[PDB]
Design an enzyme around this catalytic site. Structure first.
Site, PDB file in Angstrom:
ATOM      1  N   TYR A 104      39.865 -21.546   4.658  1.00 59.03           N
ATOM      2  CA  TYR A 104      39.338 -22.866   5.030  1.00 59.03           C
ATOM      3  C   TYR A 104      39.339 -23.849   3.856  1.00 59.03           C
ATOM      4  CZ  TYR A 104      38.001 -20.039   9.051  1.00 59.03           C
ATOM      5  OH  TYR A 104      38.040 -19.156  10.105  1.00 59.03           O
ATOM      6  N   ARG A 156      31.906 -17.784  14.570  1.00 61.13           N
ATOM      7  CA  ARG A 156      31.464 -17.615  15.951  1.00 61.13           C
ATOM      8  C   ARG A 156      30.818 -18.920  16.432  1.00 61.13           C
ATOM      9  NH1 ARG A 156      29.599 -11.063  16.134  1.00 61.13           N
ATOM     10  NH2 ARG A 156      31.441 -10.390  14.967  1.00 61.13           N
ATOM     11  N   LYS A 186      41.155  -4.905  10.247  1.00 63.04           N
ATOM     12  CA  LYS A 186      40.142  -5.917  10.516  1.00 63.04           C
ATOM     13  C   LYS A 186      38.821  -5.203  10.733  1.00 63.04           C
ATOM     14  CE  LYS A 186      38.824  -9.712  13.542  1.00 63.04           C
ATOM     15  NZ  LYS A 186      39.275 -10.852  14.436  1.00 63.04           N
ATOM     16  N   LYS A 216      31.257  -4.190  18.713  1.00 62.96           N
ATOM     17  CA  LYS A 216      32.488  -4.440  17.946  1.00 62.96           C
ATOM     18  C   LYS A 216      32.898  -3.229  17.125  1.00 62.96           C
ATOM     19  CE  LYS A 216      32.723  -9.263  18.390  1.00 62.96           C
ATOM     20  NZ  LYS A 216      33.865 -10.216  18.331  1.00 62.96           N
ATOM     21  N   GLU A 232      46.168   2.286   9.974  1.00 59.33           N
ATOM     22  CA  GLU A 232      46.297   1.082  10.793  1.00 59.33           C
ATOM     23  C   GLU A 232      47.562   0.304  10.448  1.00 59.33           C
ATOM     24  OE1 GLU A 232      44.894  -0.255  13.284  1.00 59.33           O
ATOM     25  OE2 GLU A 232      43.103   0.979  13.636  1.00 59.33           O
ATOM     26  N   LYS A 242      41.112  -8.004   7.079  1.00 57.16           N
ATOM     27  CA  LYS A 242      40.142  -9.052   7.330  1.00 57.16           C
ATOM     28  C   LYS A 242      38.797  -8.379   7.352  1.00 57.16           C
ATOM     29  CE  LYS A 242      38.896 -12.357  10.896  1.00 57.16           C
ATOM     30  NZ  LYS A 242      39.534 -13.097  11.983  1.00 57.16           N
ATOM     31  N   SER A 288      35.192 -17.179   7.463  1.00 58.68           N
ATOM     32  CA  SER A 288      34.194 -18.241   7.557  1.00 58.68           C
ATOM     33  C   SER A 288      32.958 -18.003   6.677  1.00 58.68           C
ATOM     34  CB  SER A 288      33.784 -18.435   9.019  1.00 58.68           C
ATOM     35  OG  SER A 288      33.200 -17.244   9.520  1.00 58.68           O
TER      36      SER A 288
HETATM   37 MG   LIG Z   1      45.622  -0.925  15.002  1.00 59.76          MG
END
Ligand SMILES: [Mg+2]
Ligand SMILES: [Mg+2]
Ligand SMILES: [Mg+2]
Ligand SMILES: [Mg+2]
Ligand SMILES: [Mg+2]
Ligand SMILES: [Mg+2]
Lengths: 327, 333, 327, 333, 327, 333
Positions: free
Chosen positions: A316, A214, A204, A221, A237, A252, A278
């Site tokens: 969406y 949001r 992500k 972040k 990951e 993502k 989004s």
């Molecule tokens: Mg991780």
């Protein structure tokens, strides 16, 4: 593996298979079906209510009674699962994010309601603290404003357990804390939630494409979400999340990261999901509404995910796409 | 790949993310101005500038205006332009003869830019769709089908006319089978030894081209027409490898995937399998989508460099992008 | 993977892309940036002092006040990190290497000073006992003069903890004891140093190229450093260090080992660093000063590391290179 | 590769390092005299020996002196020499005709060495830079560009003249496209069935050639000139694979990467992908750097064998190195 | 990986490089050196004694004093290591194989003598019970005549420890019990024998080629040694031995298994050894003595091992080969 | 390969070894009579049988005796013979003309066997060494070098003569470059559409051929001569891949590695990379070594099937072996 097999024009003319619809259909490598679609939904606290979202044209925040009404049709269209995102009232946000594991929190109430009314519909809950914190960051902050990894996991575990107790078939940790999949899995197993799936948001990215979300939910972040520049890092990951017990792994954002989807499927051969976020939705829908792009770009964008190696797509556009596919 | 038994908590992937300096050290890809190619829409006449509603911020420019704007493009370090002529309606025909007119817009623009900015790369478009009454990329038979080899003959004349005008790169965007080899053979025979061929190798039958068709004025001609008998089915990935392999065998110096962001998996596979100079077109619909959202305040302008970084990460050596000026400006800062 | 794709002269002329600067720029596969540079610095005990090093022309040993002055400019040039190498006074060397973990040792003092004055600058400390032993070997010797593995690790762990306490963001064990990365990681984790990076010197060779460094710092090796002949062995070293928790892995020396850098990046796809050592610096600088080679060889040598797969380069040319890149 | 779950302390990689005998058993690569090729700079005339300031310890030698020194090179077991003529200034021209003069230095030296030492390999240099007034590797057009195919024609005449002189190997160092196939076709047609072609396949536009240009006397001619339109961009690795693939298809018996130590990753990739006889040039700048440091006392003479071992480890079958005599002496002990 | 690169006659003539000795030398892919040789030796109990072996022409059983005499020359030739095989007196064989760990057993006495007289010479001891059992099988038998795995390991561990105590730098378990490498490594580590190497006989086949050895030492096997038919199985054997801590892995017999050597080196990239067994020696030597084959077959057979991927070769031809290489 | 985290004691590899039935179930390779080719030495004349001291148990046979022995070879199911004529001394020459004599031993033997045993495969040897006074595999130039292309011309005549005699397979063992393509072109032109070519592709300059040279009578002719300018250096493995690739491109139906057991790694690599019908020759020296040891009582006769199983495990589809009869007998039981 690949081998050009000495194919050369004019013996090989790649247009021959393109000549007719029937041959294009025969050689078509990928098809989108309704089996591929997951619909994210923004859930309000109240009753008999909907709200429009300025930056997500056509998308509505829904009270639970309205969510139940719309779900009847989502089920009729064959959409396999919803991803729930509660819109937390202000009074209920805190530094400790306790609302995350409230058995009467919006996500928990919505989950129970849906599991009872549509027993075959998949409910994927969001395991994350940012809907519940006053700072809107994805965890518990230390005195310097850094999101503490392990302390945040402790809260995420309580949240995941509360979702399992509410009957969610899938919990989806979207937080990007290190090691959280293993902690959540250990907790689910010890509590006897043997069959609750964990859909890890594995790779992500820190992204500008999350802006409209949001707004939808009413929420640096870079110290937890991934650098957009990095591809090899995504493999590490995913490897960790699979070792830690994830049943599905997710990339993502989506279309700006199709190369990551491809690498992840190729290397791990595990159930691989992708979120058309989004900002991707808003860009496409804005261009369609402006008359700049045809509606056909929706299915083109979703077909891309399949071709890139995704098993499922959080989008969406799920209802629109399902309607098009049904006809 | 080998996970090397990395496990939490001995491995915490957030450590490298903790500080800007370590993020910078481990950063796998970086966009630079070396990577950017700017497409430009070129009008006939003098002192003409026209806005394109479906491509906010992009203008069609007459050659005199193009020369003025190119001063700043060159100052920003943009290595090359890709020229797209806006053909006058009356110059469209069944035979697409305007494609090889030494006095056509593309040819005139090439000669002007090569003279004024000798170091600037000029990439001409080899395709018949700006020149046909029907808007298809080649010549139609009596059944309405785009003929392959007959179209190649015209594309060859066009490519030669671009080389004669001084273009350093010709970019066949037509998706006829075998056209790269035909064009290469013709360039070689004519002594155009060093004219590069940038093949549009894996170019898909996409809906993301709408705004471009407006910009160049082929939209009215094409109407509801499609290109499924030559442009690729969006569903197909393996097929792209066969397209690229043929174009490399046929002599392409660069190969391109088009559209861009909806096809990043194709960019990745093509770079991985062929290890050749690989280009990607961030097409008009991608530009329009992003612009629309930025101007609405739905997305921050930082999305521009995020979108372009994605191409580098995916394996592209260069990007044809209508954002080239904005990106170059942001990178210069 | 690779596939010649039947490319043949004259259809394929590889000179076409070389014809013009613009096309060379478009197809250019790798670029060096300042994001890639780590500057090693030799740090003196005193104040208002610098010393020249006969075998490293142009390089200076710097007292901490002088280091702070020069760092202002290194920061202005955008160099992301320094690697500190203390020049230990004689009185303070011992058989037990206790000075290694002295909270008032040069490395520790320099680290605190730099972390306070330049909070965004990366400080990579050296975890090694050879600056602190009377014999100048990289560990505690047994009665037969052999460097004891596990006993030496115990001291390295204390040293690493002292660097973390001083605020170093990265500790870099350069010792080549077996298993030291895991021991250091375990210690950092238990002490709560969650985010301190470990940059493992993973494949560090027994080399003649270290001569000038030994002079710089004022300091058999074949029983711990690697045989220059061995390539496959380097993969086993890196695999262990990654399993043991390293956040980055390094190949040392640099240019004489570019094939190792390539193999390591290819096989592990992890953050990979390379040290352009003192002897590499001295060879290049000597040839430049003699007028035998042009200054351009500096950037050529550093570009090689990028092409070979390095994510970052420890190089005594960092300032010069950063200045060239800035123009 | 598979780590096989090796973990400390069950796996301690220091165990094999504990003793010389076990280090010797597991040692993965060993340099021998089979691996060494000695480049030599050859003067016109008789009894000429000249030192080269930027290459300490290296001398230019007239043919008579070359024959004397070669006695010891042969006694040490060095398999081959690579000859580089130091062309008299007056014999340089636009047409590079001296390249194919049967009485040129290279040709004369080849005939003398083939007669005196029948088992010694002689590798001649196929390139025009020793013979051109401008110092470029080929013939210039009116725009100052090194013409590809016209240069090949001269290189072919040169290569044939070397084969006629008895060279067992011709080594085209010119970096013209397609020259390996042209030279091979010419050798075959002329009956030079067994003359080897050692292609300089991946030869980079490097700054490490400075001292060589002094040694051969092309430095004054080249001035500030560069070779970026033919020699490779140092940044590029994938491109090297395409260069080697073409040279193998065109008939090369050996392929070479140049320079050497700054390109060990290229040596590794080339050996790994093609599994063909792979050579590497430790160039003049590499030699000079090392020598300078050794003579200053900054590096021990052991660095010579360390540098050469690196080439073997990286995948080279043979190394062109100005250290060949020193290395052979050290290996003989 | 491999790529024919479109090489075609007559552009490509593979004889060109073969035309002259100098070019054959330049392209020669592998060379045997004395660094590659390990000499197995059969050791007698007595003093001032040698015995000839009918089925191993030219090979001698040597008392320790004679072994010390011959070793002076083996050392002068540069042979890096010996592999010791004691010839156990009958009185000392038993069901429990206790002689295996006798500190005054032949192997232990020979090891001490050699370590003292030639400190740089590698001594590889044999960890195996078949020289010590009355049945000559490689372990402790149950009541049905089956070689018990774990019980046998217990004895092998005691034996390995006794060799380490005697000063052997390498112990080589040749027994083919499952898991014995790990058990031996654990024991060595706990006893502080940090640097004692373990050379695992990893893929050791049930073979007719061992006949002459059995005579040399004075000694069903299919239930532990490998089926000659099996190749994939050898990869699993090696993988386990590396995980269990082996420093080197070995394939046995040798030339009849060169494909196994190749696969093992290719897959694991670890130090790989091969045993040219007694039957291979006897076949070659018999043919040479009969005048059927030239002496040159010795170096040809040993070059094969190098080409196939071996790092070292246990060979009864070690002295002969070293002499040839020295000239 | 992936170890799949198998660890003792959960994984004990002795379990499958515990019983014959489970060993049989997991057994990875099995030798059958489908795998065996028997080489045979053929004499001129009638009622001739000669023992070969350096190949115990092997006899040279006249054609009448060959026909008698072949009855049992056929009954045992041996699919094919490889014929090696023992050329009379007086029929050896510089021009090797006896190679293509329609009345040569090989040709006569082929016609006799094809008539008598129509289903038995006959593999003839295409090579000039049985026919030259010097014992080399081709025609010598004035410098004593084995000429490549001139030798091919003779090999082509030989191969055609074998096809005319009815051989189903011709096996060029000569190691001239390009001979497979030349022979294939000739067979095709002459209408020998289905004559197989079994290329000796990777055939090494080995010392294991001694007893064969005795058996065929080329030993006296060769004397101390060697074949290093055409047969491969034993040190070289990568080179074998290039040899096989060329022979497959040139039309070989099968490819062979020779010698056998000392080159099992080559068999493995060749099968792995090309996935083509791969053969291996267990040569005379391998046979002699084994026989000598068996007859001395040093090795059990079970070594025969162990040696042959190794070839199957290593990747061979078929084995040329002097043990073929013994092996077939043992397999029949
Ligand atoms: Mg991780
Ligand atoms: Mg195409
Ligand atoms: Mg280590
Ligand atoms: Mg080339
Ligand atoms: Mg085992
Ligand atoms: Mg061949």
């Amino acid at each position: 593996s690949f081998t050009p097999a000495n194919r050369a024009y004019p013996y090989t003319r790649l247009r021959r298979n393109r000549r007719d619809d029937f041959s294009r259909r025969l050689v078509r490598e990928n098809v989108l079906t309704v089996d591929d679609l997951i619909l994210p939904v923004f859930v309000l606290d109240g009753v008999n209510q909907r709200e429009s979202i300025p930056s997500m044209p056509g998308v509505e925040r829904l009270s639970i009674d309205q969510l139940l009404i719309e779900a009847e049709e989502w089920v009729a269209l064959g959409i396999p699962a919803l991803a729930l995102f509660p819109v937390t009232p202000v009074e209920k946000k805190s530094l400790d994010a306790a609302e995350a594991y409230n058995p009467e929190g919006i996500a928990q109430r919505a989950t129970r309601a849906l599991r009872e009314r549509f027993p075959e519909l998949g409910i994927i809950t969001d395991v994350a603290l940012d809907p519940f914190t006053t700072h809107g960051q994805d965890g518990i902050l230390d005195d310097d404003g850094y999101v503490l990894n392990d302390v945040s996991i402790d809260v995420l575990v309580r949240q995941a357990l509360s979702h399992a107790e509410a009957g969610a078939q899938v919990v989806a940790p979207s937080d990007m804390m290190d090691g959280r999949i293993g902690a959540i899995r250990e907790a689910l197993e010890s509590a006897g939630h043997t069959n609750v799936r964990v859909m890890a948001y594995s790779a992500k990215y820190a992204s500008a494409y999350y802006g409209p979300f949001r707004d939808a939910v009413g929420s640096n972040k870079a110290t937890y979400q991934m650098d957009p520049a990095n591809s090899d890092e995504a493999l590490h990951e995913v490897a960790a999340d699979l070792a830690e017990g994830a049943d599905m792994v997710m990339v993502k954002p989506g279309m700006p990261y199709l190369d990551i989807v491809r690498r992840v499927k190729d290397e791990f051969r595990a159930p691989t999901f992708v979120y058309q976020v989004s900002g991707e939705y808003a860009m496409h829908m804005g261009a369609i509404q402006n008359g700049w792009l045809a509606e056909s770009v929706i299915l083109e964008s979703l077909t891309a995910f399949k071709r890139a190696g995704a098993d499922g797509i959080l989008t969406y556009f799920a209802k629109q796409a399902a309607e098009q596919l049904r006809r």
